[PDB]
Design a protein that fits this description.
mainly beta, Immunoglobulin-like, five-stranded mixed β-sheet, three-stranded mixed β-sheet, 2 helices, binds copper (II) ion, transport
Length: 129
């Protein structure tokens, strides 16, 4: 079991994975977000943001308000455990977080906070083993 995962966000506004499972054998965990497909960042940009299940809609709505040049994430938003940049067709971005910021027993939502993308691009991350 690895301590990283690859996840693609595409032009039909979908992520290919709905569940990321973080092993407790990991001290650090990496998410590599790649955007296959040909649309530009300005129309079909994607990021991957990690928040606790209950904090998600708050993070999305304040993110919307933050803008592309903030990667649609409120700066220093306490709720966001980890997040990539907004990338467009043909890019990749990666984020690494301490598995120690996660509590087993808690459930986590990962989503794209690019405007209105959260409705399809959303999933759960959970601590495993
Ligand atoms: Cu998106």
């Amino acid at each position: 079991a690895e301590c990283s995962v690859d996840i693609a966000g595409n032009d039909g506004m979908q992520f290919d994975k709905k569940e990321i499972t973080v092993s407790k054998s990991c001290k650090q965990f990496t998410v590599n977000l790649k955007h296959p497909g040909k649309l530009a960042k300005n129309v079909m940009g994607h990021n991957w943001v990690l928040t606790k299940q209950a904090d998600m809609q708050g993070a999305v709505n304040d993110g919307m308000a933050a803008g592309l040049d903030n990667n649609y994430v409120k700066k220093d938003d306490a709720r966001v455990i980890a997040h990539t940049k907004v990338i467009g067709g043909g890019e990749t971005d990666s984020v690494t977080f301490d598995v120690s910021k996660l509590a087993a027993g808690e459930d986590y939502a990962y989503f794209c906070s690019f405007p209105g993308h959260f409705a399809l691009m959303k999933g759960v991350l959970k601590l495993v083993d």
